[PDB]
């Protein structure tokens, strides 16, 4: 019974870890650097998901981070849209 953490459950733990720390901090962009948290979080879930099955690649929500940053961390979808434009324009994507 070596607990096979689901691709859901890794995302559910990571989303909770990002949101609950973000709630106490944002709009402190020193201690919650939104563009870095997006650019590394999406890259780490990309790297973790790449080698997964085309079944496990259906546990992954396409708005896994972006929903929780709005619902819980109280970041605007307008602000998130240009932080994701910056992520795609500046980063190794």
């Amino acid at each position: 019974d070596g607990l096979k953490i689901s691709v859901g459950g890794v995302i559910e733990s990571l989303v909770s870890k990002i949101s609950n720390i973000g709630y106490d901090f944002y709009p402190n962009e020193i201690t919650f650097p939104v563009e870095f948290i997006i650019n590394y979080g999406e890259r780490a879930i990309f790297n973790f998901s790449r080698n997964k099955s085309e079944a496990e690649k259906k546990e992954i929500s396409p708005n896994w981070l972006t929903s929780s940053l709005h619902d819980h961390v109280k970041i605007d979808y307008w602000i998130l849209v240009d932080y994701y434009n910056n992520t795609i324009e500046k980063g190794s994507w």
């Binding site: 709630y23 106490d24 944002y26 709009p27 402190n28 709005h70 109280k74």
Partner: peptide, 17 residues
Amino acid sequence: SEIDSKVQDYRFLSPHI
């Protein structure tokens, strides 16, 4: 201690509160 974030929660309440 919560004021910084409660001044942000208010911006993502619905316009009915």
